[PDB]
A paper describes a structure:
The active site is located at the centre of this channel, marked by the location of the catalytic zinc ion, which is coordinated by His367, His371, and Glu395.
The RW-1 arginine shows significantly more interactions when compared to IW-1 isoleucine and VW-1 valine; this is likely due to a much larger charged side chain, resulting in it being able to interact with more distant residues. The RW-2 arginine side chain forms the most interactions out of all the dipeptides listed in this section. The side chain forms H-bonds with Gln266 and Thr364 and water-mediated interactions with Glu150, Asn261, Gln265, and Gln361. Interestingly, RW has a Ki value of 200 µM (0.2 mM), showing a significantly tighter binding when compared to WR (840 µM).
Residue numbers in the entry: 17 to 614
Write the structure that this text describes.
C-alpha cells in the first residue's frame, strides 16, 4: 500500500540525493581540471567520468518506475522524483553519449584555442580573444583593423566547427526525443516550468523594442559623425565591428564616442583602478565585502585556495570565459576568471560571485534542489549587485570616481551608458536561443544555417557583419555559449528579472522612492543593506525546491516576470532620447542587410 511506500520513497530519495552529489563532485573535478588546463588527457578523463555518471543516471531513471510516485501525497517528494526522471543527454545510448561528449569537447577546445595574427605583423600569431583581440575590438577606432580581427576570429571560432556543430544538433535532438520532448528547444524551455514562457518573453520584448530602436538610431547617427557615411549608412544595419564588442552584444565600450553629453562626465573607472593599484585579488575581496555588507555569506577558504582569478602565465591552453563552479560538497565553490583590472571586469566579478552566493545559500538543500529557481534567477543575482556597483553613488564611496557632479546631463550620460549594456543586450540574447531553437526544431534547412543566423541578428538587433558572408561561413559558434552548449535564454530572463530584484531591494534598502527626486532608482546603492540581504536569503536559500514564482514571491511578494521594472529604470532616458532623436531628425529602423549571400 501507498502510505508505507511513500515512507520508503522518502528514504530512497535521501540516500540517492547524497550519492548523486558525491558522484557529481567527481565529474565536476574532472571538468574543472580540463577547463583550467586543456589537454587530450584531461579531455579523456572528463568525458570518461561523465560517461560513467550518465550510465548511473540511466539506472536511477529506471529505478524511479518502481515507485508509484505520481500517486504520493507529498508535493515535495513528487517534485524530487520528477527531477530524477529527467536524464537529458544521459538518455542517449552509451555510444551516442560518448560521441556527443567528444563533439562538445572538440567545439569548446577549438574556441578556447583560437589565436590570430597581429594586423601589423603577420609573424606574431599568438593573439588570443582574451585578452588581445578583445582589447583591440573594445579600444581601436580603426575600422579596417576592427574588420580584420572580426574576420580572423569568426573564421577560426565559427566556420572551423561547422561539421561538429551539425553532429551536435543531431545528437541534441535525439536526446530530447528520448526524453519525449519535441526538440532541444522544449528540453531547455522545461527549466522555466511554464508552458506560456515563450509567449511571455515575446510580450515583454515587444514592449521594450521601441526603446531599443531609439537607442539603435541614436548610436547609428553618432557613429556616422565619427566614421563618416562611407563606413556607416543612415538607413542600413549598423556594421557590428564598430560597436566595441566581438558579438555586438553590448556597446558600452564605445560610450565615449556616442554619449549624449560629451562635455559632461562619463563614468569609466578603469584608469583609477589601475592608478590605485587594484589587483584581481582586491576586486574579489571587494565583491566579498559587498555580499557580507548585506548580511549574506562570506566566501569560504576553499574559494580563495582553489579559484583561478588570473590568466596563467605558463603558456597552457584553458577556457578563459569567466565561470562559477559548485563542487556539491560543503563550501567547495570556485571561480575561474582571467581577471583584468577594468570597470567591466569589476562587474563580472560581482556577476560570478552571485553564482557563488547562490551555491552557498542552497547547499543544505537536497542535491536535486541545489540549482537556481530557474536558470535566469542564477544569472540575475550578481547583476543586481553590479547595478549598485555601477552607480556614481557607490563609485564615489569607494574612491573610484572623483569630482563628479550629478546634474541632469551627467544622469542622462549614465542612464545611456547603462542602456548600452542592458537594453542593447536584450535582442542579442533572444536571437542566440531563437537561432538554436530553430535548428533544434528542424525549421531551417542545412543549406541555410548561416544566413538564418545573420537574418535573426538583422531583424532583431539591426546589426550586420563588416564583410559579406555566405553559406561557406558558419558564424554562430564564434560565440562562446554556442560552441560550449550553454543555453542563452537564462541571460534574457536575467536582464528582465534583475530589474525586478533591484527595484525591490532598493525599496527595502530605503534607496528608492518614486516620489522623491533624491532617491532615483538609477542611483540606488544597496551596499550595506541587511534588509536587501534578507530578501536574497529568503529566495536563494530555496534553490529549486519550489517553482520559480514561489521563489520570486519569497523575495518581494510577486509571482510574475514583468518588464515594468526595467522600463521604470530607463523611463527618464526614454523621454529624453525620444525628444533628442526628433530634435536631430534621426532615422529609426533599417533596411534588410545584404551582408549574407545565399
Ligand atoms: C516516452 O514515450 C514512450 C511512448 O511513446 C514511452 O515508452 C513506453 O513506456 C511505457 C511505460 O513504461 C511502456 O509500457 C510497457 O509496455 C510493455 C509492453 O510493450 C511492448 O509491446 C509494445 C507493442 O504493443 C512495443 O512497442 C514495446 O516496445 C514493448 O516491447 C508492458 O508489458 C508493460 O506492462 C508492465 O508494466 C505496467 C506497469 O504499470 C504501471 O506501474 C504499476 C506497477 O505497480 C501499475 O500497477 C500501474 O497502474 C501502472 O500501470 C503493468 O501494468 C503491467 O502489468 C506490466 O508489469 C508496460 O505497459 C511502453 O512499452 C513504451 N512504449 C513505447 C516505447 O512505445 C517512454 O517511456 C516515454 N519516455 C519517458 C522518458 O517518459
Ligand atoms: C596540465 O595537464 C597535464 C595533463 O594532461 C599535466 O601533466 C600538466 O602538468 C598540467 N599543467 C598544469 C599547469 O597543471
Ligand atoms: C543577519 O542574518 C541573521 C540570520 O542569518 C539574522 O538573525 C540577523 O538579524 C541579521 N543581521 C542583521 C545585521 O540584520
Ligand atoms: Zn553567469
Amino acid at each position: 500500500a501507498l502510505v508505507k511506500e511513500e515512507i520508503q520513497a522518502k528514504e530512497y530519495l535521501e540516500n540517492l540525493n547524497k550519492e548523486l552529489a558525491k558522484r557529481t563532485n567527481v565529474e565536476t573535478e574532472a571538468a574543472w581540471a580540463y577547463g583550467s588546463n586543456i589537454t587530450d588527457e584531461n579531455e579523456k578523463k572528463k568525458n570518461e567520468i561523465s560517461a560513467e555518471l550518465a550510465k548511473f543516471m540511466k539506472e536511477v531513471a529506471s529505478d524511479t518506475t518502481k515507485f508509484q510516485w505520481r500517486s504520493y501525497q507529498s508535493e515535495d517528494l513528487k517534485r524530487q522524483f520528477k527531477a530524477l526522471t529527467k536524464l537529458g543527454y544521459a538518455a542517449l545510448p552509451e555510444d551516442d553519449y560518448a560521441e556527443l561528449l567528444d563533439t562538445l569537447s572538440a567545439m569548446e577546445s577549438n574556441f578556447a584555442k583560437v589565436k590570430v595574427c597581429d594586423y601589423k605583423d603577420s609573424t606574431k600569431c599568438d593573439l588570443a580573444l582574451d585578452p588581445e583581440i578583445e582589447e583591440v575590438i573594445s579600444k581601436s577606432r580603426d575600422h579596417e583593423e576592427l574588420a580584420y580581427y572580426w574576420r580572423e576570429f569568426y573564421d577560426k571560432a565559427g566556420t572551423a566547427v561547422r561539421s561538429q556543430f551539425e553532429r551536435y544538433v543531431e545528437l541534441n535532438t535525439k536526446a530530447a526525443k528520448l526524453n519525449n520532448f519535441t526538440s532541444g528547444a522544449e528540453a531547455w524551455l522545461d527549466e522555466y516550468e511554464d508552458d506560456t514562457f515563450e509567449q511571455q518573453l515575446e510580450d515583454i520584448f515587444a514592449d521594450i523594442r521601441p526603446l531599443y530602436q531609439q537607442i539603435h538610431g541614436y548610436v547609428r547617427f553618432r557613429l556616422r559623425k565619427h566614421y563618416g557615411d562611407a563606413v556607416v549608412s543612415e538607413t542600413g544595419p549598423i556594421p557590428m565591428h564598430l560597436l566595441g564588442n566581438m558579438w555586438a552584444q553590448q556597446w558600452s565600450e564605445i560610450a565615449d564616442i556616442v554619449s549624449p553629453f560629451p562635455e559632461k562626465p562619463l563614468v569609466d573607472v578603469s584608469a583609477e583602478m589601475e592608478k590605485q593599484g587594484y589587483t584581481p585579488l582586491k576586486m574579489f575581496q571587494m565583491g566579498d565585502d559587498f555580499f557580507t555588507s548585506m548580511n549574506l555569506t562570506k566566501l569560504p577558504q576553499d574559494f580563495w585556495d582553489k579559484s583561478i582569478i588570473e590568466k596563467p602565465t605558463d603558456g597552457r591552453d584553458l577556457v578563459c570565459h569567466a565561470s562559477a563552479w559548485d563542487f556539491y560538497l560543503i563550501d567547495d565553490v570556485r571561480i575561474k576568471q582571467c581577471t583584468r583590472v577594468t570597470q567591466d571586469q569589476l562587474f563580472t566579478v560581482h556577476h560570478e560571485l552571485g553564482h557563488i552566493q547562490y551555491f552557498l545559500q542552497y547547499q543544505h538543500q537536497p542535491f536535486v534542489y541545489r540549482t537556481g529557481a530557474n536558470p535566469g534567477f542564477h544569472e540575475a543575482v550578481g547583476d543586481v549587485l553590479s547595478l549598485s556597483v555601477s552607480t556614481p553613488k557607490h563609485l564615489e564611496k569607494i574612491g573610484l570616481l572623483k569630482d563628479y557632479v550629478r546634474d541632469d546631463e551627467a544622469r542622462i550620460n549614465q542612464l545611456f551608458l547603462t542602456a548600452l549594456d542592458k537594453i542593447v543586450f536584450l535582442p542579442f540574447a533572444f536571437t542566440m536561443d531563437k537561432y538554436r531553437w530553430s535548428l533544434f526544431r528542424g525549421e531551417v534547412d542545412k543549406a541555410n544555417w548561416n544566413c538564418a543566423f545573420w537574418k535573426l541578428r538583422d531583424e532583431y538587433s539591426g546589426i550586420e557583419p563588416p564583410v559579406v558572408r555566405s553559406e561557406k561561413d558558419f558564424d554562430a559558434p564564434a560565440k562562446y555559449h554556442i560552441s560550449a552548449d550553454v543555453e542563452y535564454l537564462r541571460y534574457l530572463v536575467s536582464f528582465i528579472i534583475q530589474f525586478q530584484f533591484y527595484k525591490s531591494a532598493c525599496i527595502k534598502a530605503g534607496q528608492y522612492d518614486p516620489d522623491n527626486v533624491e532617491l532615483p532608482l538609477d542611483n540606488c546603492d544597496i551596499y550595506g543593506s541587511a534588509a536587501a540581504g534578507a530578501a536574497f536569503h529568503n529566495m536563494l536559500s530555496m534553490g529549486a525546491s519550489k517553482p520559480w514564482p514561489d521563489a520570486l514571491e519569497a523575495f518581494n511578494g510577486e509571482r510574475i516576470m514583468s518588464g515594468k521594472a526595467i522600463a521604470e529604470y530607463f523611463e527618464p532616458l526614454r523621454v529624453w532620447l525620444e525628444a533628442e532623436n526628433i530634435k536631430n531628425n534621426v532615422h529609426i529602423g533599417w533596411t534588410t542587410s545584404n551582408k549574407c549571400v545565399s
